Amino acid sequence: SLVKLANTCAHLQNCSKVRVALTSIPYTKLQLQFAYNLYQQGFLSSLQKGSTMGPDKDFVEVTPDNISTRRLWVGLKYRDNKPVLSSCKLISKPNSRIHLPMEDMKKLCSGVTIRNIKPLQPGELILVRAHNNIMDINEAISKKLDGEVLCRVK
Amino acid sequence: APPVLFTVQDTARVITLNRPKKLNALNAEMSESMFKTLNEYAKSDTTNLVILKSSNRPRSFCAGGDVATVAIFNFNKEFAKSIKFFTDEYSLNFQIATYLKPIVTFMDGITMGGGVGLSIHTPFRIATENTKWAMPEMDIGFFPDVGSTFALPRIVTLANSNSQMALYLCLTGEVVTGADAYMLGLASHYVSSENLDALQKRLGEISPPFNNDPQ
Amino acid sequence: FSRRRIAYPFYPFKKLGRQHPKKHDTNLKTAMRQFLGPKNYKGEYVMNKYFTVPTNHVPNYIKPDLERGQSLEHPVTKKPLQLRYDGTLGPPPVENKRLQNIFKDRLLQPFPSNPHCKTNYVLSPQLKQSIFEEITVEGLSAQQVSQKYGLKIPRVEAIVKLVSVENSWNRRNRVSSDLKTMDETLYRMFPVFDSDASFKRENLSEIPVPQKTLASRFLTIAESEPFGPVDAAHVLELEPAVETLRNLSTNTKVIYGELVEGERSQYKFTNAKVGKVGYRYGSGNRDNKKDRRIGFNKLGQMVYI
Amino acid sequence: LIEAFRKEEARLLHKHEYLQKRTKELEKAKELELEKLNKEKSSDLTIMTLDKM
RNA sequence: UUAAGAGUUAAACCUAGCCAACGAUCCAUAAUCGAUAAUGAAAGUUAGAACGAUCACGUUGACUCUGAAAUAUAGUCAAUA
Ligand SMILES: [Mg+2]
Ligand SMILES: [Mg+2]
Ligand SMILES: [Mg+2]
Ligand SMILES: [Mg+2]
Ligand SMILES: [Mg+2]
Ligand SMILES: [Mg+2]
Ligand SMILES: [Mg+2]
Ligand SMILES: [Mg+2]
Ligand SMILES: [Mg+2]
Ligand SMILES: [Mg+2]
Ligand SMILES: [Mg+2]
Numbered sequence A: 001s002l003v004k005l006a007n008t009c010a011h012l013q014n015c016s017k018v019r020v021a022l023t024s025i026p027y028t029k030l031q032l033q034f035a036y037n038l039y040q041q042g043f044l045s046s047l048q049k050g051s052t053m054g055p056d057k058d059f060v061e062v063t064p065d066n067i068s069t070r071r072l073w074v075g076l077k078y079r080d081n082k083p084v085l086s087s088c089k090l091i092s093k094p095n096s097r098i099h100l101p102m103e104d105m106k107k108l109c110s111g112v113t114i115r116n117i118k119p120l121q122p123g124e125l126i127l128v129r130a131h132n133n134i135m136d137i138n139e140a141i142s143k144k145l146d147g148e149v150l151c152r153v154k
Numbered sequence B: 001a002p003p004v005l006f007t008v009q010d011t012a013r014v015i016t017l018n019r020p021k022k023l024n025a026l027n028a029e030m031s032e033s034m035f036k037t038l039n040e041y042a043k044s045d046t047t048n049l050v051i052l053k054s055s056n057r058p059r060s061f062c063a064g065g066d067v068a069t070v071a072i073f074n075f076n077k078e079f080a081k082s083i084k085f086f087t088d089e090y091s092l093n094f095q096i097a098t099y100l101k102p103i104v105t106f107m108d109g110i111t112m113g114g115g116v117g118l119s120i121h122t123p124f125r126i127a128t129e130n131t132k133w134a135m136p137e138m139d140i141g142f143f144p145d146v147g148s149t150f151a152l153p154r155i156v157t158l159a160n161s162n163s164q165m166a167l168y169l170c171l172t173g174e175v176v177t178g179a180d181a182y183m184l185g186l187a188s189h190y191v192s193s194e195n196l197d198a199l200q201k202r203l204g205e206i207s208p209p210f211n212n213d214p215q
Numbered sequence C: 001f002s003r004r005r006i007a008y009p010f011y012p013f014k015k016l017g018r019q020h021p022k023k024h025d026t027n028l029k030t031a032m033r034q035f036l037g038p039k040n041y042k043g044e045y046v047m048n049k050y051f052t053v054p055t056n057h058v059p060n061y062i063k064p065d066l067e068r069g070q071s072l073e074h075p076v077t078k079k080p081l082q083l084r085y086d087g088t089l090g091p092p093p094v095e096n097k098r099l100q101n102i103f104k105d106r107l108l109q110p111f112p113s114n115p116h117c118k119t120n121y122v123l124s125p126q127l128k129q130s131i132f133e134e135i136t137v138e139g140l141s142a143q144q145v146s147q148k149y150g151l152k153i154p155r156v157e158a159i160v161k162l163v164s165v166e167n168s169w170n171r172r173n174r175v176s177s178d179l180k181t182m183d184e185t186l187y188r189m190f191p192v193f194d195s196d197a198s199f200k201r202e203n204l205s206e207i208p209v210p211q212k213t214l215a216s217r218f219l220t221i222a223e224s225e226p227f228g229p230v231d232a233a234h235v236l237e238l239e240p241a242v243e244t245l246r247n248l249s250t251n252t253k254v255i256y257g258e259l260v261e262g263e264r265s266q267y268k269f270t271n272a273k274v275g276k277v278g279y280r281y282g283s284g285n286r287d288n289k290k291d292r293r294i295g296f297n298k299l300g301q302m303v304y305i
Numbered sequence D: 001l002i003e004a005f006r007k008e009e010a011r012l013l014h015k016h017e018y019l020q021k022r023t024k025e026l027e028k029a030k031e032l033e034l035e036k037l038n039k040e041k042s043s044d045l046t047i048m049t050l051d052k053m
Numbered sequence E: 001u002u003a004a005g006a007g008u009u010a011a012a013c014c015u016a017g018c019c020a021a022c023g024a025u026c027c028a029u030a031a032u033c034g035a036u037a038a039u040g041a042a043a044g045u046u047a048g049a050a051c052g053a054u055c056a057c058g059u060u061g062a063c064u065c066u067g068a069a070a071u072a073u074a075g076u077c078a079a080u081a
Helices: A002-018 A029-038 A101-111 A137-142 B027-042 B067-075 B079-097 B113-119 B150-156 B164-172 B179-185 B193-205 C027-036 C125-136 C142-149 C153-171 C177-187 C230-233 C239-249 D002-036 D044-045
Strands: A024-027 A044-051 A068-077 A089-090 A126-128 A133-136 A148-154 B004-009 B012-017 B049-054 B060-063 B103-107 B110-114 B126-127 B132-136 C254-256 C268-272 C293-297 C301-304
Touching: A002 A024, A002 A029, A002 A044, A002 A068, A002 A089, A002 A148, A002 B193, A024 A029, A029 A044, A029 A068, A029 A133, A044 B004, A068 B132, A068 B179, A101 A126, A101 A137, A101 A148, A126 A137, A133 A137, B004 B027, B012 B027, B012 B193, B027 B079, B027 D044, B049 B060, B060 B067, B060 B113, B079 B113, B103 B113, B113 B150, B150 B164, B179 C268, C027 C125, C125 C142, C125 C153, C142 C153, C230 C239
Parallel strands: B012 B049, B049 B103, B060 B110, B103 B126, B110 B132
Antiparallel strands: A024 A068, A044 A068, A089 A148, A126 A133, A126 A148, B004 B012, C254 C268, C293 C301
16 A cells, blocks of 8 residues: 555654654554565664554564554664654655666666656665565665565655 | 564664573574674674673573583583584673673673673673672582683672682672672672663764774 | 956066157067067077976976066076166076975976876886887787886887887988987986886776766665675676776688789678668768768778768 | 578577577576575674564 | 458448547648657657658549559540640
């Protein structure tokens, strides 16, 4: 769901503007993969499963009985009076989905504007969806995998 | 879950011992993972210091080495596995002792055997009200194993002109608790448990002022 | 803001005062005369520093800023001069301190406004003969001659060819007296290349910068990964920069045709492939266009490609 | 005309052989590369992981 | 009928459909295009003179013969001069 991912991107920007250390996002496979990619890339300090009330201290198993009250809790990073995660935007919008082949992805990573997408920036992460796996654009290039260019985060 | 967890605090790297049921007893898997990851951190230019702590925060930091397996590796004559175990543990101790970046050890809880080895070789070792420090190898037919015979003759403050207080601690295996460990020099700082969170944030923030040399 | 600015000298000079109604003079002309000094009956300016060529392998480039635009000297004693109030040329009242301690880099700088233009070093005939002998007789590869003498390889090959031409000309007594005097006066004007010095020997590790690399690209990786020149070369899809130096240091079927007595030309047929050979149909015509292709024949005649 | 017809036959069959070899050489080079991006790198110890979750 | 499908053209019978506000029908305007030319950072925009490709026409309209292929710059009839 790109609408929910857009909501998460905007919510992360909102939480970085006010400098809250911990916030929540919807509990879904796409949301969890996105948060994990941010966490492994150093944009998030922590990623926990939890409820609508807070992160879970101990493991709580997710079932249809509690699926509606699950959340993913993410810790935001700040350093030198600046947020680490300043901007977070979608490339492939719900009303214009952008699927690129590996060659155009390499062009985008090499400074070429492809389909009006500004190229990758020095400290930016572009995520790509392939076979319902979110992954870094450079990783998709290494694996020679075409995919949907999903979002930028800087 | 993995027996050791590695996390990040904005410049510091946090290593959490993650075996609560066995009181963070140290293994060869644990020692190898810690040794390799510290080798990685020694090269990183975005790492400033390492924090050593435990998830089982109040009760134990590291309740010795897991020498029961070492004893079963010798009841079944698998002496090579015991050799690997001690090689990993002592190479890790040697790494921690000679590390060129600050290492900070939170000795919040029981600290024995391998725990002393993890904590005694760093200039920054923090005791709390919960610190229960001991060296109980004499009663299991074993020796001070983790470089304690090197450290204690040097770091202990009182009655240690000829290593005799170090000998008392080693031979008797007396449990030294809390501020007594700080006063004897077994711990370098004394911080209440409730503060160790805030300290952990602070240690994650400070960087060298300029020329970015954390060594 | 901009107006026309007559290029008066930037340094002080004595301007015209009251002028006889028929002088018809300009301040620029007087400035040039003062710069040049008096002209002989032979049409010479002996008093100007730059009139005569140097002889000690130290180029005599202009220094209008160091010497305050005072270009006059005694031709024999080489001591500075200045124009006194009475129209004579005499010693300066005070001595310049900017003309004695001149940075050695400035002495090889032809133009005072361009620090990046420097004269090259002439090679002595002995060194050129040494290189020619090494390459042609001892058969040493140009790479090791370049390394030994600190000269770029194309320069070494050019030296070989030029020395060969010189040898032919000397064998034919074509180098006249005037040519030898011109060559030796030119040779004594420039600094002499010194093989031994580290700062006078050419850098031997230069490669062209291709367009592909010029764009800055950045990779975010785990904090401890090694990333060397080979990994960078892989990322940019190029050979590593060392094979570029290594490679810079270093079939079609044809049918010749039957010639018979009286035939003025021969046919050679080079094998080709349909879809690649031929003049294309509806190709761009540039003859009326500003970028029309001009080439030169094997006889040097300008032709239209 | 026989030479042209038979050389064309030969060229087509040779092209098919070459394309099969190219496919089975790429299918090996690609797998070698994917696997060589599976050798555990020591630096991977510095990437934060939450494998259990 | 045609070498050949088809309301293509001719004849008969039926069914009541078909297109259209994502623009039908009607009207006006225009030969069309390129690895051609112009322009621009580029997407594009412009031209369609030159080079090349395709179409249509040879004063206007319809028909016919021959022919593999023609409503042919042919022939017949008519119009205009
Ligand atoms: Mg003006
Ligand atoms: Mg029909
Ligand atoms: Mg009908
Ligand atoms: Mg209409
Ligand atoms: Mg028209
Ligand atoms: Mg048009
Ligand atoms: Mg035309
Ligand atoms: Mg024309
Ligand atoms: Mg016609
Ligand atoms: Mg006419
Ligand atoms: Mg007509």
